[PDB]
Write a protein that binds this ligand. Structure first.
Ligand SMILES: [Ca+2]
Ligand SMILES: [Ca+2]
Ligand SMILES: [Ca+2]
Ligand SMILES: [Ca+2]
Lengths: 541, 541
């Protein structure tokens, strides 16, 4: 006869005042939080809403989340009652291949790509800020693989009356916290600004495979999915005219907008413990309610990729959402991403919180500036355990070192960081070098520039082209390999004197050029470089 | 037990004499209005009718509305029992392209448009005004984009025996208070008076996406819907013969009549709280009942766009509609739109109520003139808390400063406020002008006319063309930019004497012309202008 308004299984007083789940001899017990006998064993103090069946409005209950009777692919950070469990799938593009529409063996362009999940922010000054849909922008390689390939349009033989067809290899990736079971979304390939070339639509129930969190659908040891290469019934290619081809060759960038139609939800069944796809549940019934009653936080501290989580905060207008527990910013960071306090300081695996850069949108900036004024403080890193969150807040934590473009991708840091990151030299040789460059710093480097300094000092650039900076490689053990052999007619570096200096430069992605310049510049004159490597000729060998 | 006739969950005496929903320890509590302890916390005193399950006849209950057990996309002012929740969706047209029906790279004409929701009233005196329909008019840009493009019919190269095709990019927009979930409406494109060119019937349930209030269906970071472009199952073009092309070039105006077929309603499910689209409920059942038992009020204070809200008022001939609470005009403005009285004066974000203009239909003007007669007063702005509202009224609150056309769109103000709007100069030069013009004032300006004055005084107009007035540009920092270089062959203002005077004119949207006059008049001779700018040539540098 205890009260239970929401029918999840936990009585109301437990959900308000704190509860925990403990395993005795082998059985599980759900008991209230008694501080002296529970903190010792290392248990977690849960708090929930006594009037919602799921506090984060996702399809898994509070009981099912804390007690483990859940579909086991739900990510471990989403087993808290206040972290939402929902999938976020986008499309990753491996490589494209461009042919002319009908001896065509050396008349195709086959390039590698690079796809990243984007979070487009406010434009600076001459064009709720952060919007909720899955989109990724690819970046086609501008370097050369064939020794004498040039001039894409004349490489193929494209004229103004001709059309060009496109083909590519894609694979999906779920970076959220819940699995997708049968249906895959319908992404669309936008070129330029609004010019949709095609809508990539997978066949319905052509799979029965699960798409678990942090996993790819054609797995990394299988073959990718090719756009419209199957032909047969779908012999409809992806056609571009001449103007669109010129726009693609100028910009060298596409965009893949993915929608949010997923399948059904697989639910635990209390009789025999079987997880089975429920045709009564659906993700489209849940995703708006997740998006309206939770606070979004985006973070890239594990690697330079954006990771989105949502945390169930209050909304002071509705009385049903004033029932959820109070959520400070510190606790949200601790339960959602994995920060900790080893000695008092909130850090993320060594990196302190003061090395990250808080960026809100408009409404959140107003909302937090009011709290900072009423708390009488100016440093947000001091009062991080008093900033209350509310619903529809958008926060964006990012690393302070690098510089980010309009889509919040790291495109190149300060020069002092790049110089510091190249201080570990393992092997020096006439053919190449070996360094221990960090994984984070090596994301933002577009390429390298090699030139020879005389004893007096001169400048002769071996790879003196915009599309010849691709020399660097990486052995899997953890050691990169720069290569002078690649653009020196497969002959080693011409050490004319042992008292010379071999100057190597680095260029970040915000400074590189991907096209020929205005008049004729296929040279590295107008490219900003950073001094990286300058040693004598007799310390090389 | 307590009496509860309507069977929603609130007892009768509470609904008649006032109630509110308080949150104690963490649980919610529906209580009568205790004036001592509910006024301090800032709660709202609700009132409803004890015999209607939904007082504003919309498909959400009174209980569901006050307690927060509602769809979270329902607009926040429609959380009151006395404000109806229903969608008002129309079509926004972005840009059109016109070409001849079949080398067509310069045989086309591409223009940007401007779409606004209309509220067509009666003609002045020489032909009850307000009716229930969603329609918007577009305004194709009459000015030029290239250097010397002219003469639309000769630009496309048409004769009397030619037909032209039409293609455009549209976007739906929901400005009501409730969302649509699967179905999109079926608009029709009307040229002139009744010449329907085509009916847009974008296929239902090829989407599953939501059209939330104050949001667009292909969202602003996606690509728009193209009219009849892809041809997948659309083998018919949008044809237009020569006569209709002549009227289109004469008018440069269309019309988009959108009907009211929407999908189903998503309702709260009390066992697990899942908001799920119910196949039983439907908006077609609800919308006439909303339209017969409420009193609409149209307002354009936030910007110069019309916003329609409906407030549940009594109807004295009906015994079930004498159950609803008494609604005054002040309370309707306070709960529907967001007016407040800080000191005792009803004002909408600083602007006092006396800055707005009241307009009724015939029946409402009779009904309100009788109330002013029996109240013994002549000023409606003084007795605004004693004007009772009844059902089927129609009020139109609009801004006093402007002048409105047939569709109640702001098309011009008086001269004095236009001169006052341009007295903030950020930077002045011979290249352009930097100003802070207010965003509402700059919505009624069609373009500018620039000219140079002699030291004795002469009249030399630089851009002396009707299609060469678009010399204003707006940057995202919030500051406009006039530009002399646009029609001076990319060359700055040729000042001949530093003691000259520069004169810039402004032409509003009611005074501009879209077609040259009867003989050949591409001149700006008979165009009513306004003195904006008069400095010297030695002060702009
Ligand atoms: Ca409970
Ligand atoms: Ca609960
Ligand atoms: Ca009742
Ligand atoms: Ca009622």
């Amino acid at each position: 006869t205890v009260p239970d308004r929401d029918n999840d299984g936990i009585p109301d007083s437990l959900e308000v005042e704190g509860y925990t789940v403990d395993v005795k001899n082998k059985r599980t017990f759900l008991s209230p939080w008694i501080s002296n006998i529970h903190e010792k064993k290392g248990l977690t103090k849960y708090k929930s809403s006594p009037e919602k069946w799921s506090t984060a409005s996702d399809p898994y209950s509070d009981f099912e989340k804390v007690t483990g009777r859940i579909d086991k692919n739900v990510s471990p950070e989403a087993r808290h009652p206040l972290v939402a469990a929902y999938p976020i799938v986008h499309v990753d593009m491996e490589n494209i291949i461009l042919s002319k529409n009908e001896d065509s063996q050396t008349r195709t362009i086959s390039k590698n790509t690079s796809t990243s999940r984007t979070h487009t922010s406010e434009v600076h000054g001459n064009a709720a800020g952060f919007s909720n849909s899955n989109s990724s922008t690819v970046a086609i390689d501008h370097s050369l693989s064939l020794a004498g390939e040039r001039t894409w349009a004349e490489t193929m033989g494209l004229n103004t009356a001709d059309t060009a067809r496109l083909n590519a290899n894609i694979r999906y990736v779920n970076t959220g916290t819940a699995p997708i079971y049968n249906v895959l979304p319908t992404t669309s390939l936008v070129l330029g600004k609004n010019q949709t070339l095609a809508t990539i639509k997978a066949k319905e129930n052509q799979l029965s495979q699960i798409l678990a969190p942090n996993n790819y659908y054609p797995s990394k040891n299988l073959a990718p999915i090719a756009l419209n290469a199957q032909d047969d019934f779908s012999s409809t290619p992806i056609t571009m005219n001449y103007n669109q081809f010129l726009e693609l060759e100028k910009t060298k960038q596409l965009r893949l907008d993915t929608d949010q139609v997923y399948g059904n939800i697989a639910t635990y069944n209390f009789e025999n413990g079987r997880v089975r796809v429920d045709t009564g549940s659906n993700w489209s019934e849940v995703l708006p309610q997740i998006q309206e009653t939770t606070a979004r936080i985006i973070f890239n501290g594990k690697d330079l990729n954006l990771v989105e989580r949502r945390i169930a905060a209050v909304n002071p207008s509705k009385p049903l959402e004033t029932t959820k527990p109070d959520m400070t910013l510190k606790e949200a960071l601790k339960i959602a991403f994995g920060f900790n306090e080893p000695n008092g300081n909130l850090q993320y695996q060594g990196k302190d919180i003061t090395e990250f850069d808080f960026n809100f949108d408009q409404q959140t900036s107003q909302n937090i500036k009011n709290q900072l004024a009423e708390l009488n403080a100016t440093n947000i890193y001091t009062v991080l355990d008093k900033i209350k969150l509310n619903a529809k807040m958008n926060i964006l934590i990012r690393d302070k070192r690098f510089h980010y473009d309009r889509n919040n991708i790291a495109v190149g840091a300060d020069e002092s960081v790049v110089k510091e990151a190249h201080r570990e030299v393992i092997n020096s040789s006439t053919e190449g070098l070996l360094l221990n460059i960090d994984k984070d710093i090596r994301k933002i480097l577009s390429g390298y520039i090699v030139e020879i300094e005389d004893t007096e000092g001169l400048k002769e650039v071996i790879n003196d082209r915009y599309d010849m900076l691709n020399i660097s490689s990486l052995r899997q053990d953890g050691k990169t390999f720069i290569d002078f052999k690649k653009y020196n007619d497969k002959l080693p570096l011409y050490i004319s004197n042992p008292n010379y200096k071999v100057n190597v430069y680095a260029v970040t992605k915000e400074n590189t050029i991907i096209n020929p310049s205005e008049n004729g510049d296929t040279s590295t004159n107008g490219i900003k470089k950073i001094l990286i490597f300058s040693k004598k000729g007799y310390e090389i060998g």
